[model samples]
Target: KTLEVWIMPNSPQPAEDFKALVAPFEKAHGVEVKVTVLDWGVAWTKITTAATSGVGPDLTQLGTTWVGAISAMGVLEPVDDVLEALGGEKAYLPAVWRTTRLEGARQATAVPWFSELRAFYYRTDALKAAGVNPAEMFASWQGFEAGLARLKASSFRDPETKAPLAPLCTPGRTPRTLHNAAPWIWGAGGEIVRQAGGRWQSALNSPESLEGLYFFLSLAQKGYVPAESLEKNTAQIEADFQAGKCAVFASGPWMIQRAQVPEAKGGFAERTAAKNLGVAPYPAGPKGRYTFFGGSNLALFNFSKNKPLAKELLKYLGGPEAQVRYAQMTGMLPALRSAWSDPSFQQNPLLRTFIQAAQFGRTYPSLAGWGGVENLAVQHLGMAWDLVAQGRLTREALKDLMDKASAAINQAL
Candidate 1:
């Protein structure tokens, strides 16, 4: 049998590496494997188009958040039997496994492949220079904001550009920011949606959620982050951070490798020494520390002809040894708790932070319309932020706009 798989182009591991990782399964089962690499933006379209047109790959990588929407559309096959054959969901991280299962579904529509959890990145040297400690300063959002203000105020201007250093670098109008900001909402005791009578209701307008949103936006208003941040996306923000224009940023473990520019040395040595880079979890909010988990899952398209072979491939991918090796090779936190005990993870304290954070992380709602809802929310929130930046939106107006957006969301639901 031949198995067809489509992987995300941005996946940390190279396509050749993934193929080599799964080579043993192919040999053992006397099967051939075909791999296709697709950009994240087109990954879903490829899978769905193939499914709807009856010509899709046997297996593909899907965003964990899309499980509900894809499953609801009846384009993915339940993989419970496959999981059972491989020793069940207990093999993976509890939260990640739950992502594959819909509210009332008896089987999982996808299988946990990997995981990414939020962590804070800061400048230790800058903190020391300012007489602040990263560990203590991160105790609360308010404290962190104060520290950021101090960093911005005391930093000298660039000789050429004559711009004060930015305390933080956060991208705007992207899924990355939405994911990063969600925990703030949760920490404020707010949710994106609440389940009532077996359906989701908009919770974005609640005082708690709004408070979180404002807290995030205030970083920009206070000059902790750049004013033009609203126009930049994650890639540009990352570039700015690497250039030493920003003192701190938020990202996952994968950032450790990304910060290493060729000119800065192969392992972030120059950048770290120049900026005294530091890593920590996101600052605790009023409610508690929280962060969103963002990653992908492996799923079998319902229309695939090689369902049995695809199931075997997925099981092999989910096995503990495979997960541990994948994590070590890719710098991504594996979705299996057992893999944490591997020497690769145990030796790295930074990677362990992700494991700990993910243990208590929250996922976005699982609705077929989640993507649409997210688009609506991001647009409205961007508009609201623009108003606030221009002094056109008062606190009351902000609240009213959020309420109006929530009402529109509810109507869509």
Candidate 2:
């Protein structure tokens, strides 16, 4: 028997697919490999529980963002020694490679396996009709707003639902909405929180942040977004994108892949490559452009009974051969920079968008309490979006609510 690995499957790839990939590793090493695919919703509970009890798989897929929480729990093993054997920081993308290291420590608890982030996936056909250029359209917030206006004014509509297409596909009520909303704030020179005097301070209520908030809220209030959007999660919103309910997508990479399949083939049926599929750096505001830095990091658990083999498997998985295979099997981009240089990866039109977003992506504050802060922040944002959509809040009143919400988040932290 050999070490077990966990696959917290968040993409289209199945457990059998991972097994197929692992088959070669199993035969070459003459070791039995067991793999399990866990549900994303309960993944945290399972991971934290197993780590706390000092039991579970030897290696597991972990969210890069979760490194802060898990490392703080004292459940992770320092991999500085392994980093020396491996290619070290330079071997990986700079943005992703840095997440390997944790706070108040000189070692990494995790290494990037696959990487991803959201991009401005827009319907190119709609843009051409609107006489808009992807390069110039997102050069400023004004351009961003104009493109959304054009998208809203477009003639596209779902044949069955009859729901009119909106310019943006952002999920307003889903817990993940905060990730999508943060870019707007950062683009506008707003800080959700800032470090001062060695403590985190909530900065969401600042004037710059409110400007971002108002722009985000006005999309729904102005009827550019569906009125009932608050009732749906991100998945539900993205589900309708193929039906032409939305045009400009600010979501993950999986969408583009699914869009290429025929509806009869169980795909979303957008067939993006045929239509105008354009990806761009997230729209910028006064300051800059930013997208949520996200993706899983492969980690060897401290509780592993087969530490040596686990490290070996980890090393193998991070290699060019394995990374390319994994990326091909799952639409996830490989963490190894050299793996991305593969001609097949370079040829994909959708990947160009992903590669661009990953190059400059930024993640949430990596603090132990930041997870709680993110939940509270998303709730506050969802509430504010709901109120603005209801036509029940004045500009000053909305700003006041935002300020109070930030204060509450700071207090919780």
Candidate 3:
């Protein structure tokens, strides 16, 4: 009579909100739906245990990158029938649909729920004060650095704090470090990992990938991105941004939702921060423009005794109604292309920029070994940031670091 579903805290009160969000499905099916919220820190271990122990919920949320690893466990039920009924593979965004199965697999075990991409968030007032045009700031990597240099040179002061505004604020030593760096690597025509001879190999040591890495690290080395950020995380940086310490930053659409909250509740909407905000896609690099493309996915465990009911729930979630509603609630873009046609998305100017950036979004190769590979990247690339901030990251040091990281990643693969 009841179906168990697990999801992450991707939004405020996700468990409670999602439980209520699916009330319509519960009523139509005459079933009690139990929703459990999981924290990202421990979700992997819990999901792994459940997959092996056959004691998990009927349905659970999986990170887009996790699908490959979890699918290798062979505990997720194939969703080809559900996918076909929902209008087939062509119905969803191309990049999003790619994570549904292992690379080159004929069957899909998970369905995309929503997506989030990196976007530039700037203070319009600061740009004006620096005499920097928005177009020049976002036109290319060289222009972006020049704009930041101008902002620093202009010495724009924070209204409330009276301190000189930092040109940019970005996080360091966090899982997000990979997301932040992937675009730079990709834009320089590089790959983090590429399959060769039926085996996954690390491509980080390649000339092109290292070129992007150096450029990304140079932001800190050149004093554009604050050196203090070497010790901070995304949440801390975002809080600092809200407090008006930085002129520009790059984050996902969720920051827009954060800005939407009333100032009375610690949000930016009631402050000058809201009035001066601007959203735009990433700047082009030497080869191409790209941003991190990733989001959560929904999958059914093989042990689910309520497969029939659970599958119905999956179908409902994939529809525009649920996709659009959840997107509005979480600031995540819907995986379904049709959901973008809804009025709420169509009317929001910030959302429109995100929709545009999605065209150039990219993700890491979908392989079981990617988890370990990403872990290695977090450690190696994070060290690079520390070196850059400390004024010690040389070209020789970076090449040596990438060579070591690539060897380790190849071993893991």
Candidate 4:
């Protein structure tokens, strides 16, 4: 008679906004739909609490990254049938499928709903000004580092006027900056914590991990990311790029839309973006290109009194009609390949980079314990990087801080 659901605030749709989405399903199935929207930070807490209390929504949205953590607790019902009904693993993006299939797990724990990812947002005009070949130079780390150095040295004036035009800008103040750097670590064969034969243990001190950290932090140490990043957040960095004050920044597909200015808007619009704003898979390291993906899936637990009913609802939700409707409503990339295959997402070529990168994206560990570990690492990382960038902690000490942070996480685990 009634079905309950939990969704994330980032859905870009409010609780009331669901009326249209759920209406067709409800009328066809003879059900009343109830929805609860949760704050991203607190949603996991509520979800975990719902697990132990054995009381929660009939079906709900799940963070693809958190699938393992929740599924391990026996809080989520297996969706293998659902996945097959939706066309199985090959039907979805490779990088996205990997996220839902937790390492060594038996079930297709969650079904793919949509995809979200980021890549290197570079200024073609800036690259040209620096005389760097956009293709060959960005494919390798050594080339990228040297290219940044080159970009900083040539045609880069205004050193006397202001911030010598940031070669690269990141929201260094937030934990996400750390997430964005995962490809470097992964490429070097390093992982944050490994689910070794079922036990979660820290890999932060591993050789490759240290190498990746050093490479990422080296940007600031060598002045590629700028030491002054300690004083700023991602928005200021974005504004710098938005105003054509920087050469590059890493951002999501939304950037195509974010950079477009209306006829009334001026200033930065002079740079003439849209065609000039080129994107690429975030530069790779030793292991080949890699990145972290943030996406959503829908699942229900065995505790639901209407478990059978929940599966039917999930079907409709994952269908093309619902996928297309949601995509149009939010400007989000759809989970279905057919919708994005032309590679012409909304007729924008800029999105092709995201589509290609979607093949190599990775995910954070999904252990329930990982939630706490990830949260703790965010605090420690945000603190350590700020110190390193502020000249308070030497780049050499980044290893020590990360090692200490990892040990603490393992202890807490």
lDDT by residue for model 3 over 275-321, one digit each (tens)?
A: 78898788899898999999989999988999999999999997778
Of 2 and 4, the candidate ahead on lDDT is 2
* Whole-model Cα lDDT of every candidate shown, in order: 0.75, 0.75, 0.86, 0.72
Task: Flag regions of model 2 displaced more than 4 Å.
Answer: 156-164, 174-177, 262-266, 269-276
lDDT of 3 at 39: 90
Between which residue pairs do clashes occur in model 1?
none
Q: What is the Cα root-mean-square deviation between model 2 and the actual structure?
A: 2.4
lDDT of 4: 0.72
TM-score of each: 0.92, 0.92, 0.96, 0.82
lDDT of 2 by residue, 1-413 (tens): 58798888744656777888778889988999888888878888888888889889888888877887888888777776666566887887777876775655677888778887888777776777667788887777788877777777866654455555677776666465377788878777887888788878888888888888777777677666776665777778766566666777677776666666666645665444335566777877788888887789888887788888788788888778888888876677888888888987888877887887775587766667767777767777767766766777456876777777788887876
Q: Tens digits of per-residue lDDT for model 1 on 35-135?
A: 98998757768777776787778888888888877788777888888777667767766667777866568778988888888887776666776777787
How would you order the candidates by TM-score, starting with the best?
3, 1, 2, 4
Q: Ranking by lDDT, best first? A: 3, 2, 1, 4
Q: Between which residue pairs do clashes occur in model 4?
A: 69-366, 171-234
Per-candidate alpha-carbon RMSD to the true structure? 2.6, 2.4, 1.5, 4.1
For candidate 4, the clash count comes to: 2
TM-score, cand. 2: 0.92
